[PDB]
Amino acid sequence: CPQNCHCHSDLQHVICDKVGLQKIPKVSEKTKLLNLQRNNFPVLAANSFRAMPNLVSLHLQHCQIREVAAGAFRGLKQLIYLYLSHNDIRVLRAGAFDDLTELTYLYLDHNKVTELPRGLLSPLVNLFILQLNNNKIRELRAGAFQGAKDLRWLYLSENALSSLQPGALDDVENLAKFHVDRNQLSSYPSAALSKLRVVEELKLSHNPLKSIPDNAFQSFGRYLETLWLDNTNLEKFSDGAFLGVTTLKHVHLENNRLNQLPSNFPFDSLETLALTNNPWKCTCQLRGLRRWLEAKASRPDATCASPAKFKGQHIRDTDAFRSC
Amino acid sequence: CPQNCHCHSDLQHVICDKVGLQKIPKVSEKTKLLNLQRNNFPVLAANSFRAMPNLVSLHLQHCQIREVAAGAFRGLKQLIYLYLSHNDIRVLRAGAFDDLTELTYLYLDHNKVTELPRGLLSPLVNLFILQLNNNKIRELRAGAFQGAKDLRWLYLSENALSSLQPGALDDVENLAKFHVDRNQLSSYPSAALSKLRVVEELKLSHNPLKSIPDNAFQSFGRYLETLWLDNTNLEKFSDGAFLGVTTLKHVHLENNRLNQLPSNFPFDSLETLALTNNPWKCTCQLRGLRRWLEAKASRPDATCASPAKFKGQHIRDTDAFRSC
Ligand SMILES: [Cl-]
């Protein structure tokens, strides 16, 4: 057990949490968990973890890491978790994650990554979660996810994405969750998202999308269960926007400029619907929404904005749908 | 495997990181790690983790926990790690940690705890680390740590401690690290610290201590290796302050009002000494400091403030020690 660090006998855990380390310590070959959080490792040179074959979890958060050389993790074939959150990584070089065959969860959030280059994830064949929230990624170029066949949860919230290349998501067609909220997408990325086939959660909050085009959800219409479009400056849903959507259960439309919903809005499977803070127009087009709201026990405070006669009245209680 | 969460088969890990849970999920009885971070559990009632005998690690950070009822963790006999950081817990009454016999690491930092009552840690007989940084603790009453015989690392930085009752530390005489920096200690707590026998790191930065009395380090003089007294408004060391100190290696005195060092200042084992920003008076008292500075490499230096003739001169270069 290294100095300044503490070790649990039975568990083969090494704890070096904020113990002032400047170098990667030497540890037993059977070490299964190595916690090096809150230290100082500005550079992770190649073979930084040489004699650690049995390592299953490696925690390197808050280590002020600025450089990750190619092959830094070269010896860690049995590694399952890798936490690199809250460092100063600006570039992820190809080869950085070499020999991480069994890696399943990779956390790179709260760094300064600006790009995902081709082949970075090539050897990460078992990667299930890729956590990249709170970086500065501006564009996902083609090949960014080549090799990551097992990837299912992809988090890219709070970056600077202004567009998604049509080929950005070709290699991860089997994503289950895709979060790209709080970016700068100025329109619904039809080309990129049309490659996803089995998305269950799509999170697009806080992107000035303005509108949703036709066939937006076709490619994953029978898998999509949760949809976030809150604070997207949403003015309109295309009449064919929801073509092919059959199992949508939770939808967030709060804080937009929506006056109407399309005739084919899928209320059949809908379970929850956040829709407050919209200038709802209480006329006949909204009859679909009324019937659904009357059916549900939660009482949202979604009032009418127009026409003038019903302004202020709740959509659920108002008598504006008597003629329709 | 609960809904919205992912489970690793071989490791018996359950990951529910920010998946929107409102209640503690049900999991397999052999589950060894349960990650429930970034959820919302305002109340942890008794027996919240009933059928989890083999649970070894439990993560509840950022869960907006405001209340921990007695017996919340009643079934977790094999628990080793417990993370409760970054919640809104204001009170920890006795019984909160019942049946946590094997608990070794307890993180309660970044909450709003105001006091440590008697018997709170009674069943935590294997507790090694107790993290209470960034709370609002004002006073440690006698009995606060009764039962915590294995406790070695105690963090209390960033609280509101204005005094330590003489009996505060009786039960934890074997502390290795004691951090109480950034509090409101208006003087060196002689009575409380005199009970510690083997302290290796004592961290008192950012406390208006004003002075250090005689025998301040007597009871643990043969173990103290690192001492932080920076930003303590320190005017002087008592002539007997360093009685019994035999292995002091690292000392921080930066940002104080020190003009002199005591004759018995222990330079024998000293390796590092931060001493910048002090009104050093370069006369006969500082010769011990001069010789030590001359001996050390790349360990910069602080300038003289008096006498007037040597204002501005570095202690390492000055010629004020020729008549020694
Ligand atoms: Cl100075």
Side-chain angles (χ1 to χ4, degrees):
Chain A
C1 198
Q3 289 285 326
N4 297 340
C5 303
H6 182 252
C7 302
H8 204 277
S9 304
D10 185 73
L11 303 175
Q12 283 295 340
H13 292 194
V14 176
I15 301 174
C16 300
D17 193 329
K18 203 185 190 193
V19 307
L21 300 178
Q22 302 285 68
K23 303 174 185 180
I24 307 308
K26 175 178 178 74
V27 301
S28 178
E29 289 182 346
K30 289 178 78 174
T31 301
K32 293 178 72 177
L33 187 151
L34 184 63
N35 184 346
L36 308 181
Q37 292 183 57
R38 297 275 181 183
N39 286 311
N40 188 271
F41 309 129
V43 179
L44 286 177
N47 296 94
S48 290
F49 309 87
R50 186 177 300 279
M52 304 181 196
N54 300 281
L55 196 64
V56 173
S57 181
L58 177 57
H59 304 248
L60 292 161
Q61 301 99 309
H62 296 281
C63 285
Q64 307 189 265
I65 299 170
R66 309 179 72 83
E67 169 175 353
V68 180
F73 309 100
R74 182 177 297 176
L76 309 171
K77 289 192 289 183
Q78 295 297 315
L79 195 68
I80 303 298
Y81 300 76
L82 174 53
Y83 300 85
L84 285 160
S85 320
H86 293 279
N87 283 295
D88 299 356
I89 300 172
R90 283 175 172 266
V91 179
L92 292 165
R93 296 179 186 82
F97 303 120
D98 289 328
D99 216 15
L100 291 173
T101 305
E102 298 290 347
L103 189 71
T104 307
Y105 317 93
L106 173 54
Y107 296 76
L108 292 165
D109 55 286
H110 290 94
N111 282 280
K112 288 141 163 181
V113 181
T114 49
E115 177 184 1
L116 280 171
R118 183 184 63 250
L120 178 57
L121 313 181
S122 290
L124 306 177
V125 300
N126 283 331
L127 189 65
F128 187 103
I129 306 184
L130 176 57
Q131 171 58 264
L132 278 164
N133 291 341
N134 298 90
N135 276 279
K136 302 189 79 170
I137 298 174
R138 280 177 162 267
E139 304 177 356
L140 298 180
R141 300 178 183 273
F145 303 103
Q146 184 267 317
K149 296 294 189 179
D150 284 17
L151 187 66
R152 296 295 182 270
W153 298 4
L154 171 59
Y155 301 80
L156 286 170
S157 316
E158 292 169 59
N159 283 265
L161 283 161
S162 56
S163 70
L164 297 171
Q165 291 295 322
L169 302 167
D170 287 23
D171 300 307
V172 292
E173 63 187 348
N174 290 337
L175 286 184
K177 309 192 328 194
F178 186 52
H179 294 197
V180 64
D181 53 299
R182 299 175 179 281
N183 281 273
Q184 293 170 307
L185 297 172
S186 61
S187 67
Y188 186 83
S190 306
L193 289 172
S194 70
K195 301 297 189 298
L196 309 175
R197 304 306 306 251
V198 300
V199 192
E200 297 168 13
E201 176 172 16
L202 182 64
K203 197 166 196 304
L204 293 159
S205 319
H206 298 87
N207 284 287
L209 300 179
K210 289 183 283 295
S211 69
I212 306 299
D214 295 311
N215 305 104
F217 317 120
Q218 178 71 252
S219 51
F220 46 80
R222 305 201 179 185
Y223 287 83
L224 184 66
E225 286 178 18
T226 305
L227 174 65
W228 302 73
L229 295 170
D230 55 308
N231 294 95
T232 55
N233 296 330
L234 219 62
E235 288 180 352
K236 184 184 191 284
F237 281 93
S238 185
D239 299 341
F242 286 97
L243 286 167
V245 180
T246 64
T247 182
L248 186 57
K249 301 190 185 178
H250 314 276
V251 177
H252 301 252
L253 314 175
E254 53 216 329
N255 302 305
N256 279 305
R257 298 182 174 89
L258 289 166
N259 297 123
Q260 308 182 352
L261 296 180
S263 170
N264 70 339
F265 192 87
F267 293 108
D268 285 52
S269 295
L270 198 66
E271 296 182 0
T272 66
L273 179 62
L275 55 86
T276 54
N277 191 9
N278 278 282
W280 292 117
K281 183 181 179 185
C282 288
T283 68
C284 295
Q285 76 285 5
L286 278 198
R287 58 119 162 171
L289 178 57
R290 169 83 175 198
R291 197 68 193 165
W292 188 82
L293 294 170
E294 286 179 351
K296 305 299 289 193
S298 58
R299 301 171 188 175
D301 192 1
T303 59
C304 302
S306 289
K309 299 171 287 179
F310 307 106
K311 192 270 171 189
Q313 299 180 23
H314 284 67
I315 291 169
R316 191 166 185 278
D317 298 338
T318 185
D319 51 66
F321 306 127
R322 274 176 171 245
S323 298
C324 311
Chain B
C1 197
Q3 294 287 326
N4 297 96
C5 303
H6 182 252
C7 300
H8 207 276
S9 303
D10 184 73
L11 303 175
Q12 285 296 340
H13 291 194
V14 177
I15 303 301
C16 299
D17 193 329
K18 204 183 190 192
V19 307
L21 301 179
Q22 302 285 9
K23 69 187 179 183
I24 308 309
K26 48 239 70 175
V27 301
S28 179
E29 289 182 346
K30 290 181 80 173
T31 301
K32 293 180 176 179
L33 188 150
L34 184 63
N35 184 346
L36 308 180
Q37 292 183 34
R38 300 276 181 183
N39 287 309
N40 190 328
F41 309 130
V43 178
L44 286 177
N47 297 93
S48 290
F49 309 92
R50 186 177 301 280
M52 303 181 196
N54 300 281
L55 196 65
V56 173
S57 181
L58 176 57
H59 305 248
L60 292 161
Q61 301 99 309
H62 293 93
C63 286
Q64 305 190 265
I65 298 170
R66 310 176 74 86
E67 168 176 353
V68 179
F73 310 100
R74 185 177 170 187
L76 309 171
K77 290 190 289 183
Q78 293 296 315
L79 195 68
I80 303 298
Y81 302 77
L82 175 53
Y83 300 91
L84 285 159
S85 319
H86 292 96
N87 284 295
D88 299 287
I89 301 172
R90 284 180 174 78
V91 179
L92 295 164
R93 281 187 178 85
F97 302 117
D98 288 328
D99 216 15
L100 291 173
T101 304
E102 298 289 277
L103 189 72
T104 307
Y105 319 93
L106 173 54
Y107 297 84
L108 291 164
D109 55 286
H110 291 95
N111 281 280
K112 287 179 162 182
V113 181
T114 50
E115 60 180 8
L116 282 172
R118 182 184 302 274
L120 179 57
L121 312 181
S122 290
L124 306 177
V125 300
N126 283 83
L127 189 66
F128 187 80
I129 307 183
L130 176 57
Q131 248 287 6
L132 275 39
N133 290 341
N134 299 90
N135 275 279
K136 301 187 78 170
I137 300 174
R138 276 178 158 268
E139 197 172 14
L140 300 181
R141 64 178 59 246
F145 303 104
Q146 186 269 317
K149 296 295 189 179
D150 284 18
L151 187 66
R152 297 295 180 269
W153 298 3
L154 171 58
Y155 302 80
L156 286 170
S157 316
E158 287 275 5
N159 283 266
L161 284 161
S162 56
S163 70
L164 298 171
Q165 294 296 321
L169 301 166
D170 287 23
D171 300 307
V172 291
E173 63 187 348
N174 290 339
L175 286 183
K177 308 191 179 180
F178 185 51
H179 293 196
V180 61
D181 53 299
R182 302 175 180 281
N183 279 273
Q184 294 170 306
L185 294 170
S186 61
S187 67
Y188 185 81
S190 306
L193 289 172
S194 69
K195 300 297 190 298
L196 308 175
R197 297 298 201 158
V198 300
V199 172
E200 297 169 13
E201 176 172 16
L202 182 64
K203 199 166 198 305
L204 294 161
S205 318
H206 299 273
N207 284 286
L209 300 180
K210 290 183 283 295
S211 69
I212 305 298
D214 296 311
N215 305 274
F217 315 119
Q218 177 71 253
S219 51
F220 48 96
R222 305 201 179 185
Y223 286 84
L224 184 66
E225 286 178 18
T226 306
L227 174 65
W228 303 74
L229 297 171
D230 54 308
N231 295 95
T232 55
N233 296 330
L234 220 62
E235 288 180 352
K236 87 170 292 186
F237 282 94
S238 185
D239 299 341
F242 286 98
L243 287 167
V245 180
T246 64
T247 182
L248 187 58
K249 300 191 184 178
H250 315 276
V251 177
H252 303 252
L253 312 176
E254 52 216 328
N255 302 305
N256 281 306
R257 300 183 175 91
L258 289 166
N259 294 122
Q260 307 183 351
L261 297 180
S263 169
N264 69 339
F265 193 97
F267 293 111
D268 287 53
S269 295
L270 197 66
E271 295 181 0
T272 66
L273 180 62
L275 53 85
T276 55
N277 191 10
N278 280 282
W280 293 117
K281 184 178 180 184
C282 289
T283 68
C284 297
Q285 74 285 6
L286 283 198
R287 60 173 168 285
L289 176 56
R290 170 85 177 197
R291 298 184 196 196
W292 186 82
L293 294 170
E294 286 178 351
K296 291 293 164 177
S298 187
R299 293 240 147 264
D301 191 1
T303 58
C304 301
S306 288
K309 299 163 285 180
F310 306 103
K311 183 267 172 188
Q313 299 180 23
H314 287 221
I315 290 170
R316 191 171 53 194
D317 299 338
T318 184
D319 51 317
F321 306 106
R322 190 171 72 247
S323 298
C324 64

